[PDB]
Design a protein around this ligand. Structure first.
Ligand SMILES: *CC(=O)Nc1ccccc1Oc1nc(Nc2ccc(N3CCN(C)CC3)cc2)ncc1Cl
Length: 273
């Protein structure tokens, strides 16, 4: 659609290259002043666009960004292993859809929690795109190599590590972006997670492979994640309990998960033994 700007009522700035919450036809909306075949539940919908000032009109995500949920200002919300696996399943479903786009695949290129928006009490995730991103970028990208949709698989793997640990990836490296690029180019990866279930560890590290052809397709991730949710009930629970979270010491190349996998091991055991 081609929206009339006067029909919109701007409100508070949301992000700042500036995004603001607004009403348009009694519908809450996000707008942004200085592709259309995309229709998926896990991708922020583009309603239309105005002409002067030229601006995008998109659905509004009331929950803010995943990054904000994970690492934002106190008070931070509690969340569970089911939430973590659900966010990543929903992210892979949105991204699989982009990769299936005809006649040419759409690669996100910038998959990272600051661009993953939440709604429905923090339970539904939606990919947003307008394109310190080094931390989620596949090495072939910033070495100027020819990349493919496998670069998004790499980013997803980092995100999976991130929601399970509630840690910023490569937070210990710091300095400018080039230090992380150098690190990851040389094979450094986020530390392994104590007690992580072997199937999730297998999936995560595969996604981190240096060789992009050794990473799984997104369609494979979606399917694997779909079937693992049988062991992660509770993803529909709205985020609503308070959390006081503090970084446990992290050395020995081994960090503790923030989420708890005891119930996964219990439900797995019922099925298998
Ligand atoms: C695609 C993208 O990067 N989107 C995006 C990033 C940052 C801000 C806004 C963006 O677009 C956007 N945002 C939203 N909803 C939303 C709601 C609240 C917030 N807050 C919550 C409190 N914080 C302190 C930070 C911001 C951020 C974003 N809906 C849709 C769209 Cl397109």
């Amino acid at each position: 659609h081609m929206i009339d700007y006067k029909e919109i009522e701007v409100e508070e700035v949301v992000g700042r290259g500036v995004v603001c919450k607004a009403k348009w036809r009694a519908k809450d909306v996000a707008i942004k002043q200085i592709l259309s075949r995309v229709n998926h539940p896990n991708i922020v919908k583009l309603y239309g666009a105005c002409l002067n000032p030229v601006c995008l009109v998109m659905e509004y995500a009331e929950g803010g960004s995943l990054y904000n949920v994970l690492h934002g200002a106190e008070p931070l919300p509690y969340y569970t292993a089911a939430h973590a696996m659900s966010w990543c399943l929903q992210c892979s479903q949105g991204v699989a859809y982009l990769h299936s786009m005809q006649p040419k695949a759409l690669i996100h290129r910038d998959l990272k929690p600051p661009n993953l928006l939440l709604v429905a009490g923090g339970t539904v995730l939606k990919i947003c795109d307008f394109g310190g991103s080094a931390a989620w970028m596949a090495p072939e990208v910033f070495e100027g190599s020819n990349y493919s949709e496998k670069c998004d698989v790499f980013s997803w793997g980092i995100i999976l590590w991130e929601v399970i640990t509630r840690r910023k990836p490569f937070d210990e490296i710091g300095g400018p972006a080039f230090r992380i690029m150098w690190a990851v180019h040389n094979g450094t990866r986020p530390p392994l997670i104590k007690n992580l279930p072997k199937p999730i560890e297998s999936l995560m590290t595969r996604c981190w492979s240096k060789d992009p052809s050794q990473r799984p397709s997104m369609e494979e991730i979606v399917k694997i994640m779909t079937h693992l949710m049988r062991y992660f009930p509770g993803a529909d629970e709205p985020l609503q309990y308070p959390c006081q979270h503090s970084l446990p010491p992290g050395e020995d190349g081994r960090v503790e998960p923030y989420v708890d996998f005891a119930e996964f091991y219990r439900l797995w055991s019922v099925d298998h033994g």
